[PDB]
Every structure is written in C-alpha cells, then in structure tokens.
Paper text:
TREX1 is a cytosolic DNA nuclease essential for regulation of cGAS-STING immune signaling. Human TREX1 is a 3′-to-5′ exonuclease composed of an N-terminal DNase catalytic domain (amino acids 1–242) and an unstructured C-terminus (amino acids 243–314) implicated in membrane targeting. Loss of TREX1 function results in accumulation of cytosolic DNA, inappropriate activation of cGAS-STING signaling, and severe autoimmunity. The overall structure of hTREX1 adopts the homodimeric conformation previously defined for mTREX1 with enzymatic active sites on opposite outer faces of the dimer.
Residue numbers in the entry:
A (entry chain A), B (entry chain A): 5 to 46, 55 to 165, 175 to 236
The structure:
Amino acid sequence: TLPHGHMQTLIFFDMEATGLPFSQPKVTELCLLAVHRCALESPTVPPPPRVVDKLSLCVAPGKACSPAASEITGLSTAVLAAHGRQCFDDNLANLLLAFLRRQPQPWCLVAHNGDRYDFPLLQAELAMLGLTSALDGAFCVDSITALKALERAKSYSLGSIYTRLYGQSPPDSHTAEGDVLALLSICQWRPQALLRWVDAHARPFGTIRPMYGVT
Amino acid sequence: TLPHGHMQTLIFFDMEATGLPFSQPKVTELCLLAVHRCALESPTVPPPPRVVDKLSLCVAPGKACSPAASEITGLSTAVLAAHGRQCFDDNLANLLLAFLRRQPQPWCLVAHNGDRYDFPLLQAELAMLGLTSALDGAFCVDSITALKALERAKSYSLGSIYTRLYGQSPPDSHTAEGDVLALLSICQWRPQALLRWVDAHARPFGTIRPMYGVT
C-alpha cells in the first residue's frame, strides 16, 4: 500500500503534440502544475490551492501538426515559429528538472491517459536527447485509472468526469494549462481517497517505455 | 530610438515578498509570463495571446512575512513551509535562466513599479547567490513609466490603470500570476505604442542596483 512511501508533490501534467502516437508525434505544448499533498489533505468546482507552482511552455515540433491537432489546440507549426519557439532541447530538459527540483520528493506526475500518451511521449522526447535521467527520479500515475477506482468506490475522458462531478463543462479545453487545471479540479473531488490510490499505484517513471526512440 | 534593437520577447513579471524595501525583504512568490512581440504587433478586457510561456513559483523567504504582506498575498512563512517550499537558491536561478533561454533575444522584463521594487529585489536575491549573471543578458522596463507616457500621448497604480481602461477591477489581485495577467491586459490596450516605448527605453538589467547585497 506504500511501495515508495507517501508521494509528497503531485505534478499535474498535460502535453499537446502534432498527432497521434502512430505518427511519431512531437510535443507542441506542455504544462506542469505542482501541488504539495498538504493542499489535498482534507458539488461546485473548487478553487485551486493558493500555494502552487506552474510551468506552461510551447515547443517547436520540427514537423507539421495534423489538421486535427491544430483544430484541437489552436497551435500550428507556423504559428509556433512566428513566436520564435524553440525545439525540445537540452535547455528544456534542464528546465523541467530544475522545476521538479523546487518540489519535495517523492514527485508523482499525474496525467489523464498519461500511460498511453503523455508519459511515453515525454520519455521519447527525453530519449532523443539522451536525457531520460532528467525524469528518472520521478513517479507517475494515470488519472483515468485513478478516477475509475474512486468512482467505483460511463466514459472516463477528462470532460466526461468533469461534467459528471460538477455539472458544467471545463473551461479552456484548448491549452495544456486548461487541461491541467480541469484535472486538478477533478482530483480535488475526493482528495484523500485520491492520495491513498496515488500512494499505492505510483510507478517509477523509468519504467515508462518511450513512444519511440531509444529504450 | 533603438538603442538595443527591437525587443523580441516581453517577459511580464511580478514578485511578492515579505515586506517593504527598508525591511530587506525576501521573495515569497514570482511569476514570469513570456510573450513574443508578434503577439502584440497589431473597450473590454482582451483575451491573452494563445502562444505564451508561463512560470509561477512560491519561495521560502527564511524570515517572517509582515502581517500586511500576508493580508495582501495570502502567503505566510509557515504556510510556505507547510507546502515544502525551498529558499531562493542556485537551482531557482538556473530555472529562471533556463526559462529565459526558451525565449528569443533581446529579452525585456516588464514590471509595474519594477524600478523601485521587483527589479532591485530580483537583483538582490541573485547577488546573495553570486548569480547576477543569470539575468545579465536581459533588458527591463517599468510599466508605470510606460503607461504614463502612453496615456499622456491620476494614479498609475496597476488597479487604477486597469479600471480606467476597462471599467472593471482586475481579478486575482492576491497572486503574482494575477498581477502579471492584469499587467498583460493593460499592455494590450495600445500594443504598438507600448512596443515603440519599450524599444526606446529598454534598460540593461545589469544596471539595476540591488535592493541590498553586494553591488
């Protein structure tokens, strides 16, 4: 029930990309929202905690976005270039590690459908740089799996869960930060039971196999 | 009129601290919102640009916050400690530099009353670490001075300007991110004239003398 102790910081996480996994997609946006478990040790949509750390970045993917990805995210490779965005590089990896290092350990990334998309994509971008070590101290959980267990104790898409719990659609379904903020709200529904589940299911990020690139 | 060329990225910036300058205050929160000038090359409150980078962090100050600072910010040293916040350290300096390095140069920090508070406080925190080099490539402007010139072409507090331009109070006047987002909105009022002023008045950050600490 505590394979790795209590997770100290939950890092709510979302990335947007150029396409689906089969397409060897590249990140176009990412957001990390770090919340100490203290803020979760304790209807209508709750306010976020006062004390949080937030990082939201756009990324030049180096290839075209699919039309569908651009409709969903409002991003395109040309638009990212017009704003001088840089590719996923060593500096970005160092930035992610430095942000994680502001937080008390153990770190647990939390992402909706993260096992199938966000986590293997992040692993793949790091693997292409030879920098999977940037994330090797972290743990991770997929909140689809979590919310299924909490509601059991229907669709489990993020918007489905949000409207089921709060009776309104999430705002800002087109940025990575908006997805992370909606995920936070759903995780605040039954926060103590969520923390028990996270503690029991936290998985070392080093066991996430990359979507593509060296394993 | 172009002493340093066109500024490429405007980094809207705010820090909260334990007290007033006389008290040798310490940072408790900071937010940087990086916007490429493209997003400003072109009533009611406008939406922020789609493509932005955002960094918001809380910081353990190492000393008590004044009661007034805690009323204003909702932060206290004990609350920051309950959430495991770390002091302003080398890792934070590296994080700030890595975030700046995602942006095209020249970088121009933009902060309201920044010449008197935010800029010398940031310089002082870096000076105490021996890391003023983290910010030495940057430029900076104080948006009080900017908005005075734009309106000339009354109080110039952030809230005064906001309600004067948009007929409503800014939301979230208690977090660093809320101040940065309200500052962004005011800078979007006359964006081209703001950019001309910024280009003409941008000041090397190395000329900001620290609020305290080694000069």
